[PDB]
């Protein structure tokens, strides 16, 4: 069903479906199972930064995610998304939590795209800036249990009255407006996309990740993806 | 039922619905009949650019037209559109023809809106720029005789094949997502739009214009809005 | 001398020279006893940020202040720049203290400035933002006792290492490179400032302030402009 | 002595000092044998765009040349830019003339530049847009022959009173205001520049190229850098 390309934020190592034994960022084409993964120094209750970017003539899709006072950590992979993806997709951040759990708080989100053709002077842009959000945001879709506006914040997962995190949650938000990102006499296309979360658990080992996914314009949560799914896919193949 | 805020380029003087005796810009508030215009010495076959301006602080809705080359019209309107408008509205461009006619082109449109919250370092921004439309620009609502990628243009109202201007034609292509532009806690909102036209047509008197406008978000082109009433009013009151 | 139009965030009541008896904000053109001035209620010790915005078809300069969680303040004044300034500018960030005083770090700055001509197409811009300070900032001009790189911060008059202010200090801050705000055939011209500053005196009476001004490139501090005078006035005429 | 990184559009193959036996892009690291190489069909009097992009995690200097209506070029190479060049530097355009010559002419120029800390929130960004240049440009420093405002295009090398171009010329246009390319803090550091010219010679074998350059700050044209060395090289090491 879905086609998925996503950047996760995996707080827990399901090493059975292939995570590796600590917190990592991956990248995903079509699959749980990262074409690509780095090691990830997570911290609980600090607020978080993850960069993306991709470019049609590099053909490379990466990340890095980033705390205040750390090093960072940071992850690549090449994959010319034209042999992916839909020619109008929809981008969007998704998040779930099994019987291990977390918050996942979205603080801001940008996104920017581009498509330079060959025409002198000739660029199509979308461009979105989220630093503060309302409890109508009327230009996200939020499927699942996101909800908006909490703290002006958007929530990803369900959490209680006092914030903390349920199990067993899954919820996305994706910016309303289809996106364009290949075109036919496009020179150059590209994107780049940022966010910054708070990850808080009460628990040792929170589960489950966050991640920043490009999805066909129709994509829905699929059944069963909660926990080590990421709101994405369907199965662990 | 619609709520419309427009600046519009009036080619035809229809002086008995308040029309100045020439092509000229003129404000619109919730009517047909111009808060305030300016003379508008119109080039047929010419690019035109449109540029509009407006903020929050001082509440002016400000609209400049040049032609290359050419000395350039301005309009200017002291207005609150937080006492005019929705919270959330969409933003477009109309064009009609009646017994006289032209051709509506559009070439290019870039818009940027801006909110900026008291919070430090908070602003929510939404761009687009359009210098190429394809024949599927899913982003575009399109109603009316609107079409998209002829010469990778927009088509307002209906053209022949060989690009000959229709009368009695009416189209609108309205941004697909919603734009927000009042915020709780803004202390500065802002926008600004931009977009190139061609107006050509084989007549003398060509009719009827193009305007920019701000509706509410479920806006739809009104019974018999052809002609003066540039599918945006459904009377002339 | 020198050409200053400033926005001044004056600290000090100096009823003497025209302040109001608070707090303010005003707008100067060539003179310290500004054209306007709006009532502002400083808060020590807490972030701030400042909005200064101007369009050449408006011709309004407009300036609005604000702390998180407060009620902001705002100043405006009908004024043509193309009347009083230089085609190319330098702009800056100015601040003083006297036998009263105040610490007076800039935390970000950022500034865009734009100028359309007539031609299709044709956009001239400048755009620098500043989120960070280094010790070596080359493409700042300090002048006074203005240094960059402590906490990353820009401090615009002195501080003792304990991070105590000085009084009888002062000391701006130049983008380096030129700007031009007129040109021949611009149709519209338009800039915009943002800067978020950290007013902090140990005192009841903090003073002098702090002002965004735009000059003429070979601007420096006047004489004598230590205090009431901001940097960049040398006389209270 | 200078550091230099550039991308050429060199229009004559000097076989003798490695160019291959057509017109071609390259890129050079402190030497004008390239890195690398791309062969590019050349348009005499068509006005061409190059599009040149970078960034620290990817390390990939990657550059497309397209002509409207044409297929497009593009030359990648991997290199840590920080490996070869200072923390600040200035950018720029360079261009030469031998024995055979060609118009240089730049139409438009915009650059970008951004630093991006691990700090939340924490971007220092440069961008510049030239669609216009006038007699005074006093944001621009011009080596050599190159001059600006002529049909508010940039000159590079010297042109006759009939826009005929003059061989054994050499011309460079910088912007005034250094760059900062590298930061202790960077978790991510990227630019991408963007210039239209236009090359047309009265010859069928017209020299000798145009190229995007970034060196020291204090960088000036080499002593016999005319012809094939590009205004950028002192020797063919
Ligand atoms: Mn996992
Ligand atoms: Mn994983
Ligand atoms: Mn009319
Ligand atoms: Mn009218
Ligand atoms: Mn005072
Ligand atoms: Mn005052
Ligand atoms: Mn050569
Ligand atoms: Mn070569």
Redo the contacts with the bound molecule.
Sequence with gaps: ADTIVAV?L?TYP?TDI??PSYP?I?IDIKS?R?KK?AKWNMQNGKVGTAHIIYNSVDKRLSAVVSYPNADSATVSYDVDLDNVLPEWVRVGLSASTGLYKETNTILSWSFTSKLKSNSTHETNALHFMFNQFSKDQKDLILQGDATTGTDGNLELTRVSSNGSPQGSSVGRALFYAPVHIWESSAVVASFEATFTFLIKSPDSHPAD?IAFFISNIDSSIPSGSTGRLLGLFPDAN
């Design positions: 996760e995996d399901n292939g995570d990592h991956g749980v990262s993964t990740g």
